[PDB]
């Protein structure tokens, strides 16, 4: 387990951007300039429809971008676009956001970066631009003395850490059906389906309440003890954990990340969970314009050593599902990572067609379980996946 | 193992082509202009080559061979005689990504091919000049290594593989002088010894489609871990090379197949490309259909039925080629090809291929043949895991 | 229990400093050059303000540095600074000092090092230098064949030895109130508070006197017998103990460490205690410029096996509190380590908001009691903490 490249210094890294065919030019984006953020939003809206229904589009708000791209230490220099010289139009983009990972087996902590928002205009798909975008953002971070990067996607590149599968838990089945997200199984009716997904309106766990700034250190310690069971995890400073769990702005309740804690009868935090909101804009449907989507984020529980562990986790996620109902969520998603396969069945998460591959550039690691059978790709129940990180 | 040159930047590279004899001039080709593509075809037909055979290149073949994702017109370098403007030499560079498995190094490079020089200019030793100029053009795009192959004996090759041939229509191969009748044999025995079923044998065998790309790619990646040097692709790239330039039209150049088991899981796959020979001076035939083994991979490499499975795969490849007018099926002694040459009836040819990775030192590699006898060494994995068209 | 890494030789350690973002360069400090020491002082003064009030700054004297960084065996090579190449200004620092620990339960002695004075310029908090500073100081000591290091701070990392809590014992309440250190409780007056903290002007224990170089072997033996009750302790050569208890200069009374012994009629030393002085410079107070602070150091008593142990310890600390009054001390601090929880209540130490985490890099150890409830973080009275070492 360890780095792959012979190891050099920022000095040995080219000082200038890689060359591009004459029709294009690099353009560093300044997302604090609303006109440029507008450009990015448009590029994504039209062209970042990866493995999604043609009728859906990621609906990114200004608040979502603050949260996703501006954690402590973020750099404008790492928001790399490509413009067509003729008109100045934005046609490609790639980002790197700072992150710290830890490989539990070898006890290695690595300051890295997460590479995401890799977007290429649909008319430029045959220009082989992805590898160029990756080389350039990698050059920029190597200059900052960072030598490992995490990249995730459905694309098949060499040596993935592993592969997890998407899961979906219908919250408002009727609407999911009206827009084409969910299908009516063989011997079922819309009525049976809806009935089968009904949930309480109120969370069940006593002491469950929204997390606040004062809970940051306690939750962090709880997550740290808990995540020892995964192969790869994330470490945060308190300022970073605060940003990712509560939002960019400390004095305004986040509409993007929802974080909850459970404190027992004596006031001690024993469990916590978090999820983020990222809706889809829906096209060509006469009644619906938006589809509320939640994504399971980080969580942790006291009970991992006790015998009621599985039951407790399923109770935690059930309350997460219940709370999402007050935020317009229509489907609650998660992957087969962390200990997620312990609650998929009882909580009614169905397997989706999508898969996620994880790549840790410039680093060899032992194989990792992805929560699914290596050949069948079917969910394997109650198994701990080596993936303990969640990427937005 | 690693680069050779001291390493510089595109800036340190001469901005202009190096002057040629005054009689000629550099001329970048634009293959999207049919008139220029026609010029290239004529130059190749006449000067790129047995005497009675000529590579028959179609427009479709050129799209496939020269226009994969990221191809650059600036890398289609021709030379014109100033007097008449006639095209007399050419050289190309196409983007490709290699990975050296032993050292786990990934290198974005380029494949240098279609190096053609008019027969009357063979004494001006233009090849080195063509290589230097194409090399200069790619160095400018910050690429510093290149793969070049051929029968030519240049300084230090990765290794050397040998050609193999598997008669499909022996009678015709004999009619045109490709195949010879062995000492104590008859045309009748030969023909009988090469007959093959008319239908593929493996269950679940079908043509590959766009939807199989990621799955096949993962299968090839796991499989090719056994070779020393391999190729990596983006999904667009793999799709182009396995299915053709045009996504909505079945290719007549590359034939790709997958085998999915009782559960719909792809367990094997193979591909081959078609490149006929125009046949000159034969009263019966004008063309000789030729297939070349491309990339393949199998589930069974860890199992004990591996060798039998591979031979079953190739045998079905041979059978499918019969419907595309193939007269001979060729392949080199690279990859794990030596595991099926004998049982599948591939005979050694006189041709050999040398591989050169300019500006890069690598450990020796197996070529699938004995270092001194140059004879096929059965069931041996070659270090060469890349196939060049 | 034991080392974590596979174990290598100095030989397997990289011979040259780690690469740095090209803007900076490693610069070994020579604190014997007053100009360089002045640089270190300034860097600290401006940027080493973590976990303290904005209006306070650590007031480091030349004497304090001699004591803290120059014990027997100190190495200049372990005073690692970072300079911005453009101007040569000092922007970061980290030090390693030799120290020997003993793990009482497993009876393992380990020559190690204490990593401290990790300081980064406020404007580079986003360059993520700490990990790089640690890696580089760790490389230098690994070269000297030392493979374990102790690091402490408020920062949270996975698996600390334990966590202790800060305690404060107002000496001059009125001043602590004026400068905002202490707050006036709900139904209290400045007058009640002051009255509640008054102390005698003279120590009460008979035979109490200042320790001298002569007493070293006897005091050391007393501490050794005594500290057998903690999980991790420190071992000293007589030379090291002399330095840490009496100061860098043998022929001049120290203004940084105050050590005292209690002997009976026949010169038998029965108890001893020590504490060090580290003031805060006070900013923006129309009245005060400095705030005298004392920190409980090492101590030991005869009575640990006897029934008057608790009462005796309390008598000891009470005399420490009284003696600090002649050195301008305004608050007397300590952590909940050692047997400190035996005297916090009766001696009037109040719990602060600060906590200290301890980390022994490259070594797994059994859990240790930090003197606080593992769940409420509140002081747990009269208990022995596994922490028997004090870090300055």
Swiss-Prot record, chains A, C:
Pfam families: NMT (PF01233), NMT_C (PF02799)
Binding-site residues for tetradecanoyl-CoA, renumbered to this chain: 118-120, 126-130
EC number: 2.3.1.97
Further details from the record: Has an ordered Bi-Bi kinetic mechanism, with myristoyl-CoA binding taking place prior to peptide binding and CoA release occurring before acylated peptide release. Cooperative interactions between the acyl-CoA and peptide binding sites of NMT contribute to its extraordinary chain-length specificity.
Molecular-function GO terms, alphabetical: glycylpeptide N-tetradecanoyltransferase activity
Enzyme class: transferase
Main location: cytoplasm
Name of the protein in its database record: Glycylpeptide N-tetradecanoyltransferase
Its biological purpose: Adds a myristoyl group to the N-terminal glycine residue of certain cellular proteins. Substrate specificity requires an N-terminal glycine in the nascent polypeptide substrates. Ser is present at position 5 in almost all known N-myristoyl proteins and Lys is commonly encountered at postion 6. Basic residues are preferred at positions 7 and 8.
Subunit text: Monomer.
Keywords annotated in UniProt: Acyltransferase, Cytoplasm, Transferase
Family: Belongs to the NMT family.
Activity regulation description: Competitively inhibited by SC-58272, a peptidomimetic derived from the N-terminal sequence of a natural substrate.
Domain of life of the organism encoding this protein: Eukaryota
Active site: 392 (proton acceptor)
Gene transcribed to yield this protein: NMT1
Catalytic activity line of the entry: N-terminal glycyl-[protein] + tetradecanoyl-CoA = N-tetradecanoylglycyl-[protein] + CoA + H(+)
Keyword field contains Cell inner membrane: no
Subcellular location: Cytoplasm
Keyword Electron transport: no
UniProtKB/Swiss-Prot annotation, chain B:
GO molecular function: glycylpeptide N-tetradecanoyltransferase activity
Family: Belongs to the NMT family.
Official protein name in the record: Glycylpeptide N-tetradecanoyltransferase
Key word Transferase present: yes
Main subcellular location: cytoplasm
Active site: 389
GO biological process, one term: protein localization to membrane
Enzyme Commission number(s) of this protein: 2.3.1.97
Something else known: Has an ordered Bi-Bi kinetic mechanism, with myristoyl-CoA binding taking place prior to peptide binding and CoA release occurring before acylated peptide release. Cooperative interactions between the acyl-CoA and peptide binding sites of NMT contribute to its extraordinary chain-length specificity.
PANTHER family, alphabetized: GLYCYLPEPTIDE N-TETRADECANOYLTRANSFERASE, N-MYRISTOYL TRANSFERASE
Cited function: Adds a myristoyl group to the N-terminal glycine residue of certain cellular proteins. Substrate specificity requires an N-terminal glycine in the nascent polypeptide substrates. Ser is present at position 5 in almost all known N-myristoyl proteins and Lys is commonly encountered at postion 6. Basic residues are preferred at positions 7 and 8.
Subunit and partners: Monomer.
Residues that bind tetradecanoyl-CoA: 115-117, 123-127
Superkingdom assignment: Eukaryota
SUPFAM superfamilies found in the cross-reference section: Acyl-CoA N-acyltransferases (Nat)
Catalytic activity entry: N-terminal glycyl-[protein] + tetradecanoyl-CoA = N-tetradecanoylglycyl-[protein] + CoA + H(+)
An example Gene Ontology CC term for this record: cytosol
Protein's cellular compartments: Cytoplasm
Regulation: Competitively inhibited by SC-58272, a peptidomimetic derived from the N-terminal sequence of a natural substrate.
Keywords attached to this entry: Acyltransferase, Cytoplasm, Transferase
């Amino acid at each position: 387990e360890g780095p792959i490249d012979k190891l050099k210094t920022p000095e040995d890294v080219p000082n200038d951007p890689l060359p591009l065919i004459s029709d294009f030019e690099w353009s560093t984006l300044d997302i604090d300039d609303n006109l440029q953020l507008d450009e990015l939003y448009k590029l994504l809206y039209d062209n970042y429809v990866e493995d999604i229904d043609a009728t859906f589009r990621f609906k990114y708000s200004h608040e979502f971008f603050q949260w996703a791209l501006k954690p402590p230490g973020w750099r404008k220099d790492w928001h790399v676009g490509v413009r067509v010289k003729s008109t100045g139009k934005l046609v490609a983009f790639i980002a790197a956001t700072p992150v710290t990972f830890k490989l539990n087996k070898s006890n290695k902590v690595i300051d890295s970066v997460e590479i995401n928002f890799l977007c290429i205009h649909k008319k430029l798909r045959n220009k082989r631009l992805a590898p160029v975008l990756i080389k350039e953002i990698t050059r920029r971070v190597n200059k900052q003395n960072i030598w490992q990067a995490l990249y995730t996607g459905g694309s098949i590149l060499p040596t993935p850490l592993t592969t997890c599968r998407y899961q979906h838990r219908p919250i408002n089945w009727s609407k999911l059906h009206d827009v084409g997200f969910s299908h009516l199984p063989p011997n079922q009716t819309k009525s049976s389906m809806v009935a089968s997904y009904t949930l309480p309106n109120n969370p069940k766990l006593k002491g469950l309440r929204p997390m606040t700034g004062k809970d940051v250190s306690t939750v962090l310690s709880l997550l740290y003890k808990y995540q020892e069971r995964f192969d790869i995890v994330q470490l945060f400073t308190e300022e970073e954990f605060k940003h990712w769990m509560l939002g960019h702005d400390e004095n305004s309740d986040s509409n993007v990340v929802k974080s909850y804690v459970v404190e027992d009868e004596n006031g001690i935090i024993t469990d916590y969970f978090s999820y983020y909101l990222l809706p889809f804009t829906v096209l060509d449907n006469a009644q619906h314009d938006e589809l509320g989507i939640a994504y399971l984020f980080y969580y942790a529980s006291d009970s991992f050593e006790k015998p009621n562990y599985k039951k407790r986790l399923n109770e935690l996620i059930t309350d997460a599902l219940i709370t999402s109902k007050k935020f317009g969520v229509d489907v609650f998603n998660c992957l087969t990572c962390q200990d997620n396969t312990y609650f998929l069945k009882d909580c009614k998460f169905g397997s989706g067609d999508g898969f996620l591959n994880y790549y840790l550039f410039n680093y060899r690691t032992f194989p990792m379980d992805g929560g699914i059978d290596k050949k069948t790709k079917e969910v394997v129940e109650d198994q701990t996946s080596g993936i303990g990180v969640v990427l937005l």
